[PDB]
Amino acid sequence: DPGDQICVGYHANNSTEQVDTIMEKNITVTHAQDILEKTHNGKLCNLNGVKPLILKDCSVAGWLLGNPMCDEFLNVSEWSYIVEKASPANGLCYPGDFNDYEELKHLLSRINHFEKIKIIPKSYWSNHETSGVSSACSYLENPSFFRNVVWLTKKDNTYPPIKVNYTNANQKDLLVLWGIHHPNNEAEQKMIYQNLNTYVSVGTSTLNQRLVPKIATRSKVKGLSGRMDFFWTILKPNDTINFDSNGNFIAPEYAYKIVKKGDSAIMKSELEYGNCNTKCQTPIGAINSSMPFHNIHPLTIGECPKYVKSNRLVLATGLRNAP
Amino acid sequence: DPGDQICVGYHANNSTEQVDTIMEKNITVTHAQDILEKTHNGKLCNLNGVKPLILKDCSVAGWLLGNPMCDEFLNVSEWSYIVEKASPANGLCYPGDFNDYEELKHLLSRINHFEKIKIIPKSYWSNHETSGVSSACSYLENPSFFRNVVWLTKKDNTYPPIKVNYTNANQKDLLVLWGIHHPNNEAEQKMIYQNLNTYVSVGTSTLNQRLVPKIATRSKVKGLSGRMDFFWTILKPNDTINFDSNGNFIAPEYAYKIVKKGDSAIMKSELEYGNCNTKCQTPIGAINSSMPFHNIHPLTIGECPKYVKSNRLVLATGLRNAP
Amino acid sequence: DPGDQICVGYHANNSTEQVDTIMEKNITVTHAQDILEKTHNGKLCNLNGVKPLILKDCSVAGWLLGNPMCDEFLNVSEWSYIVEKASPANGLCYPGDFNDYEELKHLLSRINHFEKIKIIPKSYWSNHETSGVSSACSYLENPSFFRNVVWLTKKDNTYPPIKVNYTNANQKDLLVLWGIHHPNNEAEQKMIYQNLNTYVSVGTSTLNQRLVPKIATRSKVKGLSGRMDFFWTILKPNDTINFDSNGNFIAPEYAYKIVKKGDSAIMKSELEYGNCNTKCQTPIGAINSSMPFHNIHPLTIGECPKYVKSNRLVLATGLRNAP
Amino acid sequence: IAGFIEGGWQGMVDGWYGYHHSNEQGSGYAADKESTQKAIDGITNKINSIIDKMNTQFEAVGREFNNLERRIENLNKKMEDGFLDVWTYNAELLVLMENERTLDFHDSNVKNLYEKVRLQLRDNAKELGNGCFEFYHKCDNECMESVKNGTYDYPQYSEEARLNREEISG
Amino acid sequence: IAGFIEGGWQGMVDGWYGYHHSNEQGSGYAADKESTQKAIDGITNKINSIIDKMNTQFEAVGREFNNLERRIENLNKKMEDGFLDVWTYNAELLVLMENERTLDFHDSNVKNLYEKVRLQLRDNAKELGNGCFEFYHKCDNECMESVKNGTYDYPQYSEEARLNREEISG
Amino acid sequence: IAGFIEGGWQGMVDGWYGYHHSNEQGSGYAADKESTQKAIDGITNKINSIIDKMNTQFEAVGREFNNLERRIENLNKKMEDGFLDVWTYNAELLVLMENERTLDFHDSNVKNLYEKVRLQLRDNAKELGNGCFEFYHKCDNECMESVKNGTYDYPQYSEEARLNREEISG
Numbered sequence A, B, C: 001d002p003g004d005q006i007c008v009g010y011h012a013n014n015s016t017e018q019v020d021t022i023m024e025k026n027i028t029v030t031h032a033q034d035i036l037e038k039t040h041n042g043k044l045c046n047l048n049g050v051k052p053l054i055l056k057d058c059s060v061a062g063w064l065l066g067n068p069m070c071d072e073f074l075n076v077s078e079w080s081y082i083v084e085k086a087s088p089a090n091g092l093c094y095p096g097d098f099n100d101y102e103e104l105k106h107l108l109s110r111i112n113h114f115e116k117i118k119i120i121p122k123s124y125w126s127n128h129e130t131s132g133v134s135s136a137c138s139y140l141e142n143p144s145f146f147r148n149v150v151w152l153t154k155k156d157n158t159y160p161p162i163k164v165n166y167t168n169a170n171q172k173d174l175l176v177l178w179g180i181h182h183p184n185n186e187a188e189q190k191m192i193y194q195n196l197n198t199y200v201s202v203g204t205s206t207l208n209q210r211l212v213p214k215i216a217t218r219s220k221v222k223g224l225s226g227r228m229d230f231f232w233t234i235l236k237p238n239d240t241i242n243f244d245s246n247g248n249f250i251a252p253e254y255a256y257k258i259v260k261k262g263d264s265a266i267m268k269s270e271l272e273y274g275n276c277n278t279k280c281q282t283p284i285g286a287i288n289s290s291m292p293f294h295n296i297h298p299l300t301i302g303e304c305p306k307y308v309k310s311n312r313l314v315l316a317t318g319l320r321n322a323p
Numbered sequence D, E, F: 001i002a003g004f005i006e007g008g009w010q011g012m013v014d015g016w017y018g019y020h021h022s023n024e025q026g027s028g029y030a031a032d033k034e035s036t037q038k039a040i041d042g043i044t045n046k047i048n049s050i051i052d053k054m055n056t057q058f059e060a061v062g063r064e065f066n067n068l069e070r071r072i073e074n075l076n077k078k079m080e081d082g083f084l085d086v087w088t089y090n091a092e093l094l095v096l097m098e099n100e101r102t103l104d105f106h107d108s109n110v111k112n113l114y115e116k117v118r119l120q121l122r123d124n125a126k127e128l129g130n131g132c133f134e135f136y137h138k139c140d141n142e143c144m145e146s147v148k149n150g151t152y153d154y155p156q157y158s159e160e161a162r163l164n165r166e167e168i169s170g
């Protein structure tokens, strides 16, 4: 005869959710936890309180030196991170090279606060012309020049030896930039500088640099065969930078004060500003996520989940779901 | 009384095959799968259709410049990968240095198709001698020179200023090489070049190089104290390279066209050609294998199994085999 | 009625020892094995037989050149590894730069046995003064100079051209160091060297270096605006180094013989000697341990356990311990 | 009705592992609190501990190189890919390996629960071969709940049970 | 003859897990198709999935450095060795760990198969202690094949079985 | 007294897994040599093999960089941290994963040992539900030691055992 009963058994449900095993794939399960974040707002946002420097169509060179097509950036002070396009169009308007460029951008990725200051006012050049200008560094149709550096040229008909110094009395580090012009021939040289065998020499506690123009025939870039090579250093507090020249000097007017260092980055993105906030930013969009992983872009900044290249990371929690 | 029976049991066989466990080693098993490939044909083979460049006893420098002991390689065009011996004997016959050598070999590891062309024919040198030659760069007992570069020296008794250009009208990149001679003394200088204070200047859109000979007393290499330092660049299409000199110029005759880029490599092996085909090549031999791993050499090229340093990787498939 | 019995059961004890699991933490267990070494003697010890070079307050530069404040190290010969403080105070007493410094320290990390020898005795300078000296390189109140290099200056009132060589007849490699002085002005130059347009040229089989002083106005370091830049190479056996100069030469007197190479290191530690022995040394203390792991400092030298950043690594051996 | 041997019960909801009691006063499912909670504190801890061992993990950072630093640009690239590839492997494998250690953990928790009652009852019941037990005695909604929380007085029902067993071999 | 408790059978070949039936019409081994195939689709999938998680893995590439780039030459070397050493560890350990998860998978598949029939038979048979069962009734080469594919009508043989059991306590 | 179902025995010391025999000539614990040693050669081998797969592992080495080599100084740093972080993960996880494969190895070794005797005895004894067995016959300190080393003659005690079983259903 039928008696009383007890059974032992387990949970089921209407659960389509699957997970994976080394030995078995697409195991229908009652409960699963996905641990991979696969969506971003597709936007370049603020990072916490602070707003990014979108250089747009300029490059770090252009901004710092003052390519005329980059005037927007003439007085930036505080950012969170820098967005620079892959191939920005406005770098060095006057064709040439930027010395230790990458080591500078890398240095900028540790800075988030600049204060542009004035160390050598144009007024100082009481015996030289400060209106050297070119069609390559041209603004509104009319030829111009880098906003932060001055093309010193001959006044009346002499270029008297230059011997000028600036003392870093502030208690922050100072980024200074100078340059030098490579003329095409000895005729073009004296037409601009009078003097014929020239040098630019910069000196600090650490720096001991001598530069000499190189006359040589080069191909035309932006119509020009001339060249301007630029250089930089860090002037520590209570230290003096010393420029001496007898021609071809591209003098600094402004020097950037390093007020706040801090973890930052230079991102490479075609995107524009997005007017939004986040705590985790990738070059292709920001992240709002509690997930422990993500897969959108490896190059993140801020408190973020860990990047993996997975399409799917889902953990089993419940039991095999028998239909 | 004896009744009917059923048993539950499992497979055995005459299987000597063992596998390993964290907790237990040399477990005799019925079936095992080895997943490690431990044998190579010991030969340097073609890679798919294409055949490798075995430089034999030359080095990339020797081949490119044309060390006379490397004439075999005067007209190579298409390869799969480059084999260069560890210490090849024929590099720069005339003692000297190759500027940014490694960055060039690295660039070559992204090229698999050259087309040597002629940019400055010896005929152009209608006012200079092009028969500079040395016992270090000597061929059949008699002193010779690099096949691709010309030792310009004084004609009659003058070395008139050189000012020559080449325009890259082709739609491929161009590898150009020049050089400069460092004489031992001012006497030896004017005996060769007449002129006394000399320079070599090369110019493009990007390049802006000035070279100056260095007279100094050095040790004798191959009997010589003189030196020749060489240099290179990439001339982009529709760009012009410009040489100016008044002595010590080692002019390019030939320039290498970069027709096809592609994943390649420069392998280091003492081995010679092997006249065979493969899809996976290591510096010590090729691989024909379906295995997912191998252990012969880490530096492979082609679709290969993954390198691990294991002596043994064997998976258990069957059951413990009870004898 | 009660009958005979057998039971199946397992071990317990008074064991407070815990271990961890992915799924469960602080599991009380009967037996555990800790595999992480968490204690060091806090001392800088000998390494096997051999004793370390504690540079104390000097830097590799100071020691090698002979900063007067580093005389202790004038005749070291054999060490096991080098301890150098983070920011040693006595490097280059005369302000200046050391060329390819890091590549030298890296080279030193492969050497453990020097033999200082004499290649150019002061006696050789029969037509120059060898008593150039400075207040920056000052010893006991009185101005001195680097012990291993000689400040050649004008004798009576001439600086005749220098042309001196040294041949490496020994069967070991040789480390040689020279330098050059950058004067502040043309007046100061001729007061010291007489000659006005100067050079230093060094030549070997491989080296081909030309140096030229740079007059420029620099900031004052240790009261001075002058500068001395130093340089090095390796002279292979049966090769000759050749110095030519007409002023500003800082000649080597001594050259270091490389008698024994071997795996070594340059450690960075504030600690002093400890007068003890070990087979495993970290920058913050040595290790006597059979453990397979440790966590004190990653930068170890000698046969050591493997560094992990764990606070705790303990393996379960016994069974869950039921109280 | 039927136990674990032939599928799972949509009827139970208060837990993962449990019983169904068919007697004279009524039917119904009822989860085993002890083992179910034990499988919550466990799986949860498994999760958090996966996150925390991944809390320390490589972070890619962008670096620029010029035209003559191709060798280190390529080194940098192989390095950052290398670690990315290593950690993607470590995660996909940790998940796969612990997924398996999870489904088995469920498959054992059930069988241990079946054995928990099979040990409690023994000859006072007959195991039906489907994960169910048929009592040889009457089990009020108080003997059932006795079995569940592991508090089952065996000799108390021993006698009634024995007699009904040899009736079946009468 | 004897079951799994004392070794394995060279006699069976059509599979990994199976039975031997000793009755009145004949002996012979016969594999359990269901569980054996289940252990083929599993072990195979295990293999392919080991290969595929290794399908992405670091690739060493040669780089040349000059006499004054010893620091980066040495960095490059430690880096390429580092990843080589990491992936050699990941493979040797994946193999070792899953070898163990394999032998246990076999050791459990057998015991689950034993339990599959022990649950089907119960008192209609007596388990001999060696992985074998002795039927209390007659099992034609049709009751045997009934047990194997899991289709075993218990009450049908229930009566005959019961009577032969108390004869043994007569 | 009680077996494994309700805790472990401080009384046994000569091993990890074992028995307690309560009969007419005396009590006392006694470890099962075979399974215990089997759990020593195993756990030990597990240890050594953890060390040896770690015997090959990345070694950090210090490198100096100047003021204008910040990019490679930072590359070097991320690289040496990266491997340090990878191997710290591999160790903490290997330990955690094999700790679990260890406690389960103990939890299965016991149950396999219980099943080793439950298979040896069958109806010659009654399993008490607490990891203990009550013999239906007399088991001299010679039948006990027979059970332990797996040498148990079943038919020899079969008869006495049977008769005492139906006395309980008399």
Ligand SMILES: CC(=O)N[C@@H]1[C@@H](O)[C@H](O[C@@H]2O[C@H](CO[C@]3(C(=O)O)C[C@H](O)[C@@H](NC(C)=O)[C@H]([C@H](O)[C@H](O)CO)O3)[C@H](O)[C@H](O)[C@H]2O)[C@@H](CO)O[C@H]1O
Binding pocket: A131, A132, A133, A134, A135, A136, A143, A151, A153, A182, A183, A184, A188, A192, A223, A224, A225, A226, A227
């Ligand atoms: C100052 C002046 O009058 N210059 C005239 C030359 O410009 C002119 O030669 C042509 O110059 C073109 C470039 O002209 C600029 C430029 O870069 O746009 C004009 C600038 O004012 C000048 N700036 C300075 C400080 O000198 C600048 C400079 O000379 C060069 O950059 C030096 O490399 O050049 C362009 O190059 C044409 O191809 C060229 O023919 C000549 C022709 O008569 O007259 C000059 O007076």
Ligand SMILES: CC(=O)N[C@@H]1[C@@H](O)[C@H](O[C@@H]2O[C@H](CO[C@]3(C(=O)O)C[C@H](O)[C@@H](NC(C)=O)[C@H]([C@H](O)[C@H](O)CO)O3)[C@H](O)[C@H](O)[C@H]2O)[C@@H](CO)O[C@H]1O
Binding pocket: B131, B132, B133, B134, B135, B136, B143, B151, B153, B182, B183, B184, B188, B192, B223, B224, B225, B226, B227
């Ligand atoms: C052109 C000529 O007549 N040269 C004679 C010198 O060669 C000779 O001095 C000896 O030169 C030896 C090297 O001679 C070559 C060489 O490298 O083999 C000969 C080459 O034709 C010459 N080529 C050119 C373009 O000038 C070459 C060149 O001068 C050097 O490479 C410059 O560094 O030198 C070797 O060095 C002997 O040790 C040396 O004595 C002298 C002796 O009378 O006469 C020259 O006329």
Ligand SMILES: CC(=O)N[C@@H]1[C@@H](O)[C@H](O[C@@H]2O[C@H](CO[C@]3(C(=O)O)C[C@H](O)[C@@H](NC(C)=O)[C@H]([C@H](O)[C@H](O)CO)O3)[C@H](O)[C@H](O)[C@H]2O)[C@@H](CO)O[C@H]1O
Binding pocket: C131, C132, C133, C134, C135, C136, C143, C151, C153, C182, C183, C184, C188, C192, C223, C224, C225, C226, C227
């Ligand atoms: C040789 C001599 O008499 N020099 C006198 C100058 O020293 C002095 O100018 C002052 O020099 C100070 C530094 O003096 C030394 C030094 O570095 O301590 C003195 C050394 O003997 C000298 N050594 C050599 C080989 O020339 C050295 C050297 O000139 C510099 O290092 C070159 O850079 O300088 C300090 O710089 C003072 O600030 C400076 O005024 C002048 C003043 O009358 O007389 C010189 O005769």
Ligand SMILES: *[C@@H]1O[C@H](CO)[C@@H](O)[C@H](O)[C@H]1NC(C)=O
Binding pocket: A025, A026
């Ligand atoms: C597992 O499910 C996914 C999602 O539907 C499917 O794309 C995939 O093909 C399935 N696996 C196999 C082996 O087919």
Ligand SMILES: *[C@@H]1O[C@H](CO)[C@@H](O)[C@H](O)[C@H]1NC(C)=O
Binding pocket: A163, A164, A165, A167, A240
């Ligand atoms: C700056 O230059 C002036 C002369 O133009 C000089 O007197 C002064 O000392 C210099 N400043 C420093 C800090 O040397």
Ligand SMILES: *[C@@H]1O[C@H](CO)[C@@H](O)[C@H](O)[C@H]1NC(C)=O
Binding pocket: B025, B026
């Ligand atoms: C395992 O077998 C190999 C191959 O015969 C042998 O060399 C090795 O010694 C064996 N293992 C042990 C622990 O002896």
Ligand SMILES: *[C@@H]1O[C@H](CO)[C@@H](O)[C@H](O)[C@H]1NC(C)=O
Binding pocket: B163, B164, B165, B167, B240
């Ligand atoms: C090449 O040189 C000639 C003069 O020798 C010059 O006229 C021509 O413009 C040059 N080519 C280019 C592209 O500048």
Ligand SMILES: *[C@@H]1O[C@H](CO)[C@@H](O)[C@H](O)[C@H]1NC(C)=O
Binding pocket: C025, C026
């Ligand atoms: C595990 O034990 C340690 C040591 O007493 C303790 O600090 C820790 O809090 C314990 N774990 C938890 C989850 O509390």
Ligand SMILES: *[C@@H]1O[C@H](CO)[C@@H](O)[C@H](O)[C@H]1NC(C)=O
Binding pocket: C163, C164, C165, C167, C240
């Ligand atoms: C060293 O110099 C002398 C002249 O001062 C010279 O004769 C000798 O050949 C030189 N040594 C070598 C190896 O060239």
